[model samples]
Target: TNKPIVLSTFNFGLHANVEAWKVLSKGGKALDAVEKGVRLVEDDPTERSVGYGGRPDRDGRVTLDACIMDENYNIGSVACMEHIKNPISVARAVMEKTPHVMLVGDGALEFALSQGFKKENLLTAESEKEWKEWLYKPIVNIENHDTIGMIALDAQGNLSGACTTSGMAYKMHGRVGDSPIIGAGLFVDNEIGAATATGHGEEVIRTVGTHLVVELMNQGRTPQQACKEAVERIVKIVNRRGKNLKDIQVGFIALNKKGEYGAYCIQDGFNFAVHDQKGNRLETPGFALK
Candidate 1:
């Protein structure tokens, strides 16, 4: 089957997933394609749970995190940014324009604004209500939910992936997580494959980038083996640290140039959409085993 193929998943938002597919279908570069896809979700005011009106800090200010990586392994990211609508675009700019790989907090926001990004009140009515609810109960921690990511490969055999998230709900005003850091949340290696991860930023960050998985694939492991081993490594770390795995969920998707694919998640169920060679759509959970 010499047809084009695409695979994508969005953990908690619909905008990025839908847009990512469209970009892939149009023959866009994986990096630009993924950014454009994520931008759709970030720009959509109605998707308040994601980019713009995402979960706010205790002070009710919205912060954003995003990362992008290309087939050549060049990577860039921005985290803890405020008032910027599309953090993913800023991340891509870092990869293309800056010598640095990551930027955070006020500097990141300032850089984004300088690039013609307009400042806005990122908290929406719905998000405000959610923030207030958390404050009222004073839960020991905000729910560790609200992250979206993508992994893609183009016909040219280049691989790339991106991850964007609002971080934990009601986190500190300037908290930054793996989503905006290159290796922490996403990794790409054209010779191997690409992967983007979601769930429990704190734990994922401790994995020190999903690069180990890509490296394994580069070492001749199949996509499925790579993904499973990656998750197993993380699980061992969590257990050694005396942490509970029940509340922790992590997963990734991998695709090699041969059109072979694999996915794995610790959670009982996860969903992803794929566009195959003949222009057919398929959605499934767990690994695409077999």
Candidate 2:
């Protein structure tokens, strides 16, 4: 039937799908549905990888990165921004209100204020305590420390996606990752499909992972096959670079124009959530690490 569907990365995506369904079920725009869905995650302090209580960088600043894209190719992004609650909303404002595709750091903050977004402390007491206790210590992937990448296909068959994150915990003071970079963490092409990424941003950025997924779909690959190939391509690059694969993780989730969707990752721990006529469910994807 090619019924509308919404899917996203991680367990939190289950909640996002519920919210997105509210809009998509009503024949809303894919762009609005995605933005609203992600906004739910961005507002929760418990989601440490995303907005609100996101873990701080090395300097203890909670900088957020986000981007949104619509089927028409319009895109907006923000990176290394602070004192903002919903970076996804700010990113949307950048796409709709400004001429630039991206804004960074202080500049992004300034633009966000001009857009009537309130300036407030994003770091919560719980996050600050964790930062104080663990200063610059290398920690392996925390279960929740990754991007919330969401993509949706509306009733009308349009596509859109959004990606947001606080980036790797205690990363360099000014480090910016693929989360806010269009075509790296997220991409949408209404005619073919859409893709979004999570986990190691550097690997995704170097490979332009999400963009590669969409192109693979364009070449007649199913959404699942496209995601699998994209993950394999990343593995090839890591191997050629002589980098150890054990510590690296990346995931790709894609939805094609025909309402078919699939996902794949570099490791087994990653999973994605989906909402369709059958109802919402979490699905684990095949991984290259095995």
Candidate 3:
């Protein structure tokens, strides 16, 4: 029962899994491992969708959002935060230091600074130029999105999750997505399992996607089946609103206490990365609506 596992979106699985290994390998908690895993991506300047170098909002400012949750029902989130490179750290601080579960906008920034977090501009010249160009011509590419949701279950079967993002590229000033919202972006239930989401935050928010998957697991569904049904139901619910989701993509990643994990999406080009007892695996999508 000492199988330490980590699951994440994008190309981060291998790297974060290794960082998590530093903790899980020593019998540390899933909470520590998950935080260490995500901090790697938050420090990477090359990942333009997250942390520093992430695309900026319409005002050419980099606003960040992050959330962290453990199996014990403790959670923290920060939204529309500026000048903070590692928003996840602030989120953790809120969870540990304050009674509030969420802090937003200037209030969130003030709280972060008071906690001794040094303020620094998170926007780069390249991202500023991109934001300027996007103001006139908006392009929505799911691959160039603003989120990295990571979930983990440790040797003792405890679970945890972290989600971070820069919101959408060229998003309106003050916009916050599912990335910083619990149950929409990430959810953890040590007894049932954990699930996290990426892509089309609006759709995920409308459906409360991650919590639904965990609930599905509570009803005896496997991780694979739970993720599949979550996305399928999202597509269905979105369709009921008289909208077409063929071009929109939303993906869900799920993991059970047994170390089993799976991911499914509403469209192609959505995938997840995993490292478990079996080894490294990159699960890419192969099908969409027929």
> Which portions of model 2 show Cα errors greater than 4 Å?
136-142
lDDT winner among the candidates?
A: 2
Across 96-172, the per-residue lDDT of candidate 1 in tens digits comes to 88899899999998888878888888888888888788772212121333566777777676778778877777777
Candidate ordering by lDDT (highest first): 2, 3, 1
Q: Whole-model lDDT for model 1 versus the true structure? A: 0.71
Q: For candidate 2, write residues 55-126 as lDDT tens digits.
A: 999778999999999989999999999999999999999999998999999999999999999999989999
Clashes of each: 1, 0, 0
Put down candidate 3 lDDT per residue, 1-290, tens digits, no spaces.
42688888876667877787788778889888888888888788778878888888878888888999997999999999999888999999999999999999999999999999989978887877766676633334655645788898887889999999887777788988898899999999888889988887888899899999999999999888998898889878878988777656778888888888778887777667887767767778533465
Candidate 3: list runs displaced more than 4 Å.
Answer: 136-142, 285-288
Q: Per-candidate TM vs. native?
A: 0.88, 0.98, 0.95
Evaluated at residue 269, the lDDT of candidate 1 is 57
- Least lDDT summed over 10 consecutive residues: which range in candidate 1? 136-145
